Amino acid sequence: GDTAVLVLAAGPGTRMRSDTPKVLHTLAGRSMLSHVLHAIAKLAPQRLIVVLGHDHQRIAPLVGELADTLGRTIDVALQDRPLGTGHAVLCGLSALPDDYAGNVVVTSGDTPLLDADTLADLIATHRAVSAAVTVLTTTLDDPFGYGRILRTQDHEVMAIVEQTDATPSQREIREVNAGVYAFDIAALRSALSRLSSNNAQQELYLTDVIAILRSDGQTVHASHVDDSALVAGVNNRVQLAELASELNRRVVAAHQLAGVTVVDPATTWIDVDVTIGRDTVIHPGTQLLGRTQIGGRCVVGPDTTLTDVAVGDGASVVRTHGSSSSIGDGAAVGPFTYLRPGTALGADGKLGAFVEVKNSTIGTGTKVPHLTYVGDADIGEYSNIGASSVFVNYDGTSKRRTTVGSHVRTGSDTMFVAPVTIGDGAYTGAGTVVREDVPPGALAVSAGPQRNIENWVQRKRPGSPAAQASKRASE
Amino acid sequence: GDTAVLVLAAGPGTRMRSDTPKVLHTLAGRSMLSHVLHAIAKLAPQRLIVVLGHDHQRIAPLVGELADTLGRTIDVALQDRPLGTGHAVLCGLSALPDDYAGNVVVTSGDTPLLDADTLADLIATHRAVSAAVTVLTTTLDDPFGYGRILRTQDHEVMAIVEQTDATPSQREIREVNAGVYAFDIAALRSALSRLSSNNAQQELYLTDVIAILRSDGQTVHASHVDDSALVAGVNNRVQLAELASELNRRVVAAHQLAGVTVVDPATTWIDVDVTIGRDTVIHPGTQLLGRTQIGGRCVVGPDTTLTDVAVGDGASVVRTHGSSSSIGDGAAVGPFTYLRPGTALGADGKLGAFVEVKNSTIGTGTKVPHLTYVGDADIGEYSNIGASSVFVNYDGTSKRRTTVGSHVRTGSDTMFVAPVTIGDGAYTGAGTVVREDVPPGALAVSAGPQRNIENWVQRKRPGSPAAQASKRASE
Amino acid sequence: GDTAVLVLAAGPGTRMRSDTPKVLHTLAGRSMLSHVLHAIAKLAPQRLIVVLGHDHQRIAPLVGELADTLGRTIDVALQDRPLGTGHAVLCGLSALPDDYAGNVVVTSGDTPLLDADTLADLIATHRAVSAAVTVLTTTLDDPFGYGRILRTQDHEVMAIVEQTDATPSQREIREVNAGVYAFDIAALRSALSRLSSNNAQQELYLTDVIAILRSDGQTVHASHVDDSALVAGVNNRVQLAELASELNRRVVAAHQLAGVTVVDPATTWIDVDVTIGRDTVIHPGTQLLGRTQIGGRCVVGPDTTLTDVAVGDGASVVRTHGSSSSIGDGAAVGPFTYLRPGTALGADGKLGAFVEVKNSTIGTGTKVPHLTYVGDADIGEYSNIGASSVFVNYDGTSKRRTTVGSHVRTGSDTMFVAPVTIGDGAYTGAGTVVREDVPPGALAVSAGPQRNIENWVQRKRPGSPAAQASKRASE
Numbered sequence A, B, C: 001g002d003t004a005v006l007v008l009a010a011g012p013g014t015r016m017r018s019d020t021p022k023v024l025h026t027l028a029g030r031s032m033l034s035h036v037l038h039a040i041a042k043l044a045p046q047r048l049i050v051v052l053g054h055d056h057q058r059i060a061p062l063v064g065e066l067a068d069t070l071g072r073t074i075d076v077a078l079q080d081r082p083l084g085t086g087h088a089v090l091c092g093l094s095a096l097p098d099d100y101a102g103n104v105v106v107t108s109g110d111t112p113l114l115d116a117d118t119l120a121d122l123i124a125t126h127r128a129v130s131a132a133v134t135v136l137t138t139t140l141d142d143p144f145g146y147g148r149i150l151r152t153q154d155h156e157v158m159a160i161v162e163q164t165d166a167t168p169s170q171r172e173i174r175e176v177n178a179g180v181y182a183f184d185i186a187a188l189r190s191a192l193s194r195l196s197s198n199n200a201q202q203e204l205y206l207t208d209v210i211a212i213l214r215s216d217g218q219t220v221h222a223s224h225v226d227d228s229a230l231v232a233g234v235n236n237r238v239q240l241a242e243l244a245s246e247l248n249r250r251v252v253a254a255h256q257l258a259g260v261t262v263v264d265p266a267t268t269w270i271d272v273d274v275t276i277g278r279d280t281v282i283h284p285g286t287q288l289l290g291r292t293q294i295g296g297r298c299v300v301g302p303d304t305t306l307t308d309v310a311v312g313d314g315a316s317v318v319r320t321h322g323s324s325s326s327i328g329d330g331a332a333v334g335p336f337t338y339l340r341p342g343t344a345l346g347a348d349g350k351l352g353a354f355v356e357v358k359n360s361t362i363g364t365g366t367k368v369p370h371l372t373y374v375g376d377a378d379i380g381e382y383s384n385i386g387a388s389s390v391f392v393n394y395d396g397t398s399k400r401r402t403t404v405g406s407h408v409r410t411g412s413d414t415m416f417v418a419p420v421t422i423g424d425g426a427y428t429g430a431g432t433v434v435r436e437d438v439p440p441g442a443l444a445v446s447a448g449p450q451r452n453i454e455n456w457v458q459r460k461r462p463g464s465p466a467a468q469a470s471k472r473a474s475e
Ligand SMILES: CC(=O)SCCNC(=O)CCNC(=O)[C@H](O)C(C)(C)COP(=O)(O)OP(=O)(O)OC[C@H]1O[C@@H](n2cnc3c(N)ncnc32)[C@H](O)[C@@H]1OP(=O)(O)O
Pocket: A369, A370, A385, A386, A387, A409, A410, A411, A412, A428, A429, A430, A431, A445, A446, A447, A448, B373, B375, B390, B391, B392, B393, B394, B395, B396, B417, B433, B435, C453, C460
């Protein structure tokens, strides 16, 4: 129907002890504010307002970025002074027309696990019972901090008492206020006009509209959500880590039911935007971050961190730290491999142990197996780079590119002093410093000939164990 | 006594969403079918039949392999059409003589944590009470999917109702059918001849023989196992990961009571065939896979993956990815070390940081400390390989071997272009390309002499910060 | 007040199956005995005695070391024969004056999570109720092994029955004896003089003084601690790992409330002496060990192990194994970096992928990015070490030092054969073996010139795919 959702992100969040605003702390690839705005946008409300207190100039541009990603307008109201949650709703009420007749949903920006289904059931129950206010509730083993729900024996809601304003008998109430409301626009404005600051924290409690609307004879309703994590709030980093662990278990479980093997979900972190193909095995200690895409029948080996990495089908990424890179079908990466942004490994390519690639395009079937740095280079198809090689892309002042052809066989400890081009099918010997272009089919060497200095050990290392091993060898 | 166990592995397992059959999905080093057949074989039943539906030609050879490992015959019956668990038992009943007089135990191939003790207590209780059928039961917080146990107030078993055929009041029953049965051969055949397909799934429910045998006046018994994990079944990958985590905790706990320190059992995976010595410390992020053998007083450092690796006593394997290798007593491996198949590190040997070994035998006390690839090589005792060295074992067409003597001291950045032999006590200078044999006690060099081009920086890098550091140095 | 605490560390701890004494097994950076003695010393008792049985000569020096660290005297009594906990207290009673009039607290050396607050509430309750003996109790789901608390319906304590001396009805008691006592010095000595060895284990049960003092009309009190982990004991390595995991969760949670982001507390181990600055992010798979100090706004990346490493502010330590090193402000370390003792990385320095440093001082802004070993070296400010370089610090017999100036630009695959000095602003070409000093502003090369052997591939690799790629290139 015609609804308007308001997100209250004006709280200071002092218990986070962070120079970064609370609602912008991230989990599973999105900030808490981004998590809330994503779920609200999936219901497509007619209006959406975000109330910001201080840190408003630091958070407001990120609200506009989310408005661009979700493809709609997201208004922003600003609370001048921290006068409580009631005053914050009144600030967000100025961003609507004074003649607004739709429902008004109130939420906070620190409930990251809140989904569109819980909000849909909130407005659905709100309409089905024809209530003036519907509040979301849940039951916790520790109801500390939250506002307590006061109900009579017939389970009808009487009021909500805050933690700072609760008697010891009321502290024992384990049904808590989730902070997600659904109002009638007219009945709400009437309540907040009658709010009193005569409380412990000396603020305008939005929670007091429950009792105010009860004294008016209006229908007061509370919808109890059993899944407490969906409505849990974040005030400290301990709760942020708890909700991040819970959200990660649900993300991993969804991939498993889709056909993805996650050996150790406890030590496997997967962001919300990550896609994994069918019959892919993910080993412990792995984090899938950002917009990482894993194809089908892959093996993302243990202790692998991937951020915005696109991997094709049937590839193996074992013990790899990569970001902003592409890995083709059937490619083998790892173990102990470092992928910097700009890495495009072709299909059936190999980047082996102790190899670092940065801003390089390596064609189909080319292998870089051992102890090599590949920076700002272009390598063809079905080539082979010897071990202990380096693509020298820094002359001390600027960066230069290197071009390597197809079907080449470069020797071990080959230094490519860019800019240098290596033709197709070319060879370089072991220990070659390539400073000039190598034509196709040529062999490039530079190392001097081998010189053997006989019995040098017995003359310069006389009392050494090696001198005795050589003296005993002459027998 | 005289028993016959039948494993029903004919289910499709559609909720796994895998091109691999369900019962062949692995955990703790064995497939689910291998886990079940291992426990059954420890009781030594007279007959053992495995019922297979589709995927039968893909699973049947693996049943014969398990028959070879467990040293006995394992028969295989095949269900032509998926007509339910009752028809599957009838298919497996054709693999016995028609005059079989022993007990008949029925199990499934997706209960990997089932052990021989639970099966022994099943047949023992079955004999002690003289029942015609004994079924294993357990109590779960979520009894969904499982068949519900219907008992009267005197706890006598009446029937088993499937999830698809259960009233809402019967769904609330939390005592579930574990799927492990123990029958009388004659009383069983009589039941399955009277099965009806008039149910929701239109199949022959083996569970219906509980009520059929009750209507015959036969003794019906249910044995309740408190340890629900021992009889839990796998249908999706989420349950496969849950049981794998539970089985791993029990494997780790057994090692700890035997004298093995596991710092973080949550992030330590140990397969069932792994043996670890007394007073060995295992650090977080470690996986012990396959037939890996760890000696006593070892330190398997953090983030170490070992598959079929044999490590002696008093060795340290820190941050190492190894497979099909041997590590001698007192050897030091890691951190960041890659061990390929064929690696035989002698006692008190060292393979240090960023070292990869493949199909190489390195003698006692030899050290390969830094940034070295050792492939297809043989190194003697008490040698020392300089850093940044490479054993060149690939000339572009074939692979060649390298031989290194004892007590040698090879310099840094030494390229061993195989085939090359290095005598005992030999030396090679830094930056040497060894293309010919080095006699014992000789020194092999190849690098050109050092040439200093004075004030080259001020001429070719004029406006650089290095030119100002050199201009200021002349003071 | 005037108190005397006695720690009973005389037990054999046979279920640990360790050649190391039980109380010296470590967790969170301290042994169990060190954990107990640290909490006791925070209350500053007048006397402190540690009772040791066998392993006494192996544990006693570590008690004196703790006496030095905590800045007070810690006496040591020795139990000649394992005659039970009652005889052990009598042995520790000989280390006091026979005229001691203060309270006497008895504890064990295998309760590592015991803090000074629990001990303070023990003596406070002991004084407030004027009891002759106060014992700490808790409730467990599995009370096995522990001594059971026998209370009447008015909750008054009657006696403590050991596990070996308990009837089946007494085994069901879930309130257990924590083993932490508080005695009156006179009432205690009177009890232990009346102890009888007529029990199952044939020992002097210190627990029997509860019933003895009850038969004397003395006030017997039991203080129930709800937090069972604070008083839990260790007898096997399974319980040692459980308490280590619990203690780590509390250490991590304290850092989070202080302003430290711990993404995965389950896979993040932090020792008790570690300090972490505000707004530092710690990624999964990380262990902070020893006296490691992390500054503010840092990023300790995933899979990082740090022991006694001091990191400044705004630095990044990703995928790094380091120990006994210092990392300056704004420095970037990792991924895949090995820091050996003696490493002093200046501010804004860089130690990149596959780099190992050992006993080296690298100045401000100097970068060592790829595949380099730096051992026993001194590098100036704003220098740059090329990839695949090695600081040769071992001539086969002894170790030599290397000196590198400021603003230098050393080329890739440069071998520094120590002892060698490199002046400020100097350059070295790729593939240079530096055996002599390089003056400031000079360029040091040694590699021979490049030689191209045309169509060598078609002559020496005739039937190879590279020969066809070169034959097709001539078009
Ligand atoms: C572990 C891995 O990843 S391996 C992957 C990379 N593979 C390699 O490193 C392969 C390295 N192999 C080599 O360098 C070998 O020396 C090869 C393949 C060049 C051998 O080539 P050959 O067939 O022996 O060449 P041949 O002897 O016919 O002549 C080549 C010429 O170049 C010179 N030369 C050959 N190899 C080298 C070298 N490594 N360094 C310097 N000069 C060399 C020779 O002196 C000879 O010159 P001359 O005979 O005119 O004086």
